[PDB]
Ligand binder design. Sequence first.
Ligand SMILES: COC(=O)[C@@H]1c2cc3c(c(O)c2[C@@H](O[C@H]2C[C@H](O)[C@@H](O)[C@H](C)O2)C[C@]1(C)O)C(=O)c1c(O)cc2c(c1C3=O)O[C@H]1C[C@H](N(C)C)[C@H](O)[C@]2(C)O1
Ligand SMILES: O=C(O)CCC(=O)C(=O)O
Ligand SMILES: [Fe+3]
Length: 256
Amino acid sequence: DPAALERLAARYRRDGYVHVPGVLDAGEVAEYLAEARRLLAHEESVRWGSGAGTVMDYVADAQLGSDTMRRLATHPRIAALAEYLAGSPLRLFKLEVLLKENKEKDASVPTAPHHDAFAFPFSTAGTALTAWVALVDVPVERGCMTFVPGSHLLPDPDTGDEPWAGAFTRPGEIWMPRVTVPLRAGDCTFHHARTVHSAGANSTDEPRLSTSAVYMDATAAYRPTGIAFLDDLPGTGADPLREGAPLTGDRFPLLR
Ligand SMILES: COC(=O)[C@@H]1c2cc3c(c(O)c2[C@@H](O[C@H]2C[C@H](O)[C@@H](O)[C@H](C)O2)C[C@]1(C)O)C(=O)c1c(O)cc2c(c1C3=O)O[C@H]1C[C@H](N(C)C)[C@H](O)[C@]2(C)O1
Ligand SMILES: O=C(O)CCC(=O)C(=O)O
Ligand SMILES: [Fe+3]
C-alpha cells in the first residue's frame, strides 16, 4: 500500500523513529527467537555494563556466524521499509542479538539516553537507520525504548570523547517531550542515527530478547571513531581497515 508507506515515512521524517507492528509473523518470531536464544546460550557475548550493573548482553555481528540472523538482517520486508524510510539504497553494517535480564547478582539497569550516530565507524553515520525487532513481548516494564521526537533535527552534540554521548545537552532539549513505545513480539521500530533514545531496565523475570540492525548508505566508507572496540570490524580481513575504504561485498551486503 503506497499511501500507507508514504504516511509511515512522513512520520519517520517528523519524529526520527517509527513503530511498525507485525513486521514478522508468528512463525518467523519463533524461528528468530529460537536462534537468538541458541546464540546467547552457546556463542560468546559481550557485556555492556559497569559497577552499576548490566545494561545488556549482546552477540556482536551475529549475522556473520548465523545464516538465520543474516536472513533477519536482510529480511525483505524490513529491508524494503528501511530503504523507503532512508530514501536511498542501503547496506547492512551489523546486527546484534540483545538481552536484558535479571540474574541473581546482577539486576538489569536502564539503557541511558544516547546518540548513536557517530559511534558508527562509517562516512554516512549521520544518516544511518536502526531496526529494532522485538522477539518477545516488550511491555514498558520489560525494558522497551523511549524516543525524543524531532531530536534527529537538532545540531549534533559538542564532540566529547564518547562518540555516543551528548543526549540532553543541546539548548532547549530537556524540555522536549519523550515517547515510550511498548512493542509486541514481531513489531519493530526504525530510528534515525541522530534520534535520542533510551530504554528501561527489565524489571520482570522474563528476558528481553530482540535484535538491533544498523543500515548504512550503499556508498558508505570506513571512518574510524577512535574507540578500539567500535573500529575493529570482524570478518573484514587480516589487516585493519583504512579510512575511506569502501564497505562493500557480502560482508556489508546490499539490502536490495
Ligand atoms: C568507554 O565506555 C565503556 O567502556 C562502557 C560503555 C560502553 C558503551 C556505552 C557506554 O555509555 C559506556 C559507558 O557509559 C556510561 C554508562 C553509565 O551511564 C555510567 O555508569 C558510566 C560511567 O558511563 C560505561 C562504560 C563501562 O564505560 C554506550 O553508550 C554505547 C552506545 O551508546 C552505543 C553502542 C555501544 C556503547 C558502548 O559500548 O557499543 C556498541 C554496541 C551497541 N549495541 C549493543 C546496541 C551499539 O551498537 C553501540 C553503538 O556500539
Ligand atoms: O535495546 C536497548 O536497550 C537499546 C538499543 C539501542 O540503543 C539501539 O539499538 O540503538
Ligand atoms: Fe542506540
